[PDB]
């Protein structure tokens, strides 16, 4: 019957994109980022009616906001808390229902990033658009004045990007061509640069290893990017045991992950303080902060070594998003599972409880 | 049937002061401020054990975390959100309990104040030491680099420091003979220096309108001071009219409230969108968004002027405290009231449940 195409996490929320091209969303609702008009979180997922119809194809959250687009449409939909001007209206009001973007307009959009407080989008042919705050550099337009509506990042002008990607107040970006790019507040050489920091417009790094880069993702003040092997780096801060290499050591520089050498890496999502990463076959791979149980294995106890998440009867899962203190998984069964801190709702299983193994939420699921 | 002495507002907690050296927490408790070891919140009044004892004469409540020295055993004690040094203990891990700050024993303070992500402590002696986020200038170090330790302020050498406040990423001073000093992030007109930028280093204000400043006040993104007549002044943000001025405009110089000329202001407290002020007669106004029903005047309006506030039988009210979306008040009878948003408990009235006008906390009162 009905399925499930986008899963995304941010902070204390989730959303989800379903077949007939319906938006649903729940947890935390106090800042708007749920769209359902009011203030009240939803510990069940509730349906977004003012986006229904509306041929919605693509959702991605920020922290406290959600952005979402439809094709058909050429409209780009945004929602949730309004300051610094991340939700790219020209104003910052803070929006508790969807409300389209009057400057993206008929512009083909290929991809949306949210960080904490600035958006990126990337235009079908490869140009990036920023906005938000831009107190580090993030948004990547050579200053520090905040743009509360979307600019172009003439830095790029001839090369074409493929993805970017946001974390607290930085950016990433591999081209079509493999190079790798970081700007941003950078003081836990969250940039790849071999240094701490900050860029205003956006350096390419050329530690790579000679390895092009075919994706990246970022976490709160971390960052993943996979190769064209299938190799997977990691960067920035490692307090809490995200970076994945068995210490708690900082990396200025991409630093490849030895444990995960043997595997394909085809997805990744970075959250607050933990990391996880998808493989060919399907299998999760979690590490970083776990007082919530948000890596998945039955404990509390944090890890800094990628550990797998293991699934009922070990379905393969095809989606992993990673909000600051959950996780949200789809499987190759179309069955959805969220694991970590529960007390917003964030986990959409009815009640408001805290799991460290991943539990089954029964709306969105053709169960069992 | 203990007397309140202090209250602080968090953005989502509350703390308290009582007879006994008891301190006690409601609100929020993901990020570790209501200090029970715990991450769970509390929706009424809870005792907080560790502190047992401690003979602490005072509490101040940054945006998620919280501060309460002893003055009998001279040590300063924090816990809550951790990150870019908040709590001054030299690391950036969260306190779910109160641990002393050995960097201040010894020393002897007679105020601290708390923004979102920085701190400020006045030794007994004049002098101030600042610490945390430093990414605009808000330690007025003279540099943008957080300090996880507390560090004294050298610019301040050969003047005393009576009062500090301390904004979300902006800070102000007063002297002890009347000169008014702002630091930090200053895009909203902020820091009272006729201009919309920075400043790396504390600077006198120059239009105070030729009065001396006795007190302070930060809320997210305005200051508030009051002069030796009893004036009361806001600047920067005025989005939502807690700048009071009867309109919406941001003012970049310290701007006369006249709507407030027949009274003494006593007592003063900004917040994230709203302000609070108490005259020496006990009157307690308030302006500002009122979508949680936070200044408190029986409707849901935004109040761009000052609109006076009042309690069951025109008690008089003798303390006042701002928090993000809710109100603090204690009155002459010693009754404690709290108004606006109450979902994380943080109105310490039991269930809860927004309320747009004073209720009365029957936990903690003399009253029913």
Redesign the interface.
């Known amino acids: 019957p009905r399925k499930v195409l986008i899963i995304s996490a941010g902070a204390s929320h989730s959303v989800a994109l379903l077949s007939g091209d319906i938006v649903c969303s729940w947890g935390r609702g106090?800042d708007g980022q749920l769209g359902h008009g009011d203030?009240?979180?939803r510990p069940s997922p509730t349906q977004l009616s003012a986006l229904d119809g509306h041929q919605i194809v693509s959702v991605t959250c920020g922290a406290d906001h959600t952005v979402a687009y439809s094709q058909s449409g050429m409209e780009v939909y945004s929602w949730g808390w309004g300051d610094f001007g991340r939700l790219g209206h020209g104003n910052?009001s803070d929006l508790f229902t969807p409300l389209p973007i009057k400057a993206l307009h008929g512009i083909r959009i290929k991809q949306i990033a949210c960080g904490d407080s600035h958006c990126l989008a990337v235009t079908m042919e490869g140009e990036v658009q920023s906005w938000g705050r831009n107190?580090?550099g993030q948004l990547g337009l050579g200053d520090t004045?905040?743009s509360l509506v979307p600019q172009k990042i003439q830095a790029f002008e001839g090369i074409r990007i493929k993805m970017v990607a946001a974390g607290a107040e930085h950016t990433a970006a591999v081209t079509e061509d493999g190079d790798l790019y970081g700007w941003g507040?950078g003081?836990y050489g969250n940039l790849g640069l071999g240094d701490r920091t900050d860029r205003l417009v956006p350096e390419r790094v050329t530690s790579t290893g000679g390895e092009k880069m075919s994706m990246v993702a970022c976490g709160w003040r971390h960052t993943i990017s996979v190769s064209y092997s299938g190799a997977l780096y990691t960067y920035g801060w490692s307090?809490y045991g995200q970076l994945g290499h068995g210490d708690l050591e900082d990396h200025l520089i991409p630093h490849k992950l030895e444990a995960l050498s043997n595997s394909f890496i085809s997805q990744i999502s970075g959250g607050w303080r933990h990391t996880m990463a998808l493989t060919s076959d399907g299998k999760l791979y979690g590490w970083g902060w776990n007082?919530?149980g948000q890596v998945g294995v039955g404990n509390n106890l944090d890890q800094c070594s990628p550990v797998q998440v293991r699934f009922p009867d070990d379905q393969k899962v095809v989606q992993v998003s990673c909000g600051w203190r959950h996780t949200l998984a789809v499987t190759e069964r179309n069955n959805v599972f969220a694991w970590g801190?529960g007390?917003n709702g964030q986990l959409g299983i009815g009640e408001s409880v805290d799991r460290n193994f991943p539990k089954i939420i029964e709306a969105l699921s053709v169960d069992g």
């Open positions: 106090e203030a009240e979180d910052s107190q580090n004045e905040d507040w003081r307090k007082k919530f801190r007390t």
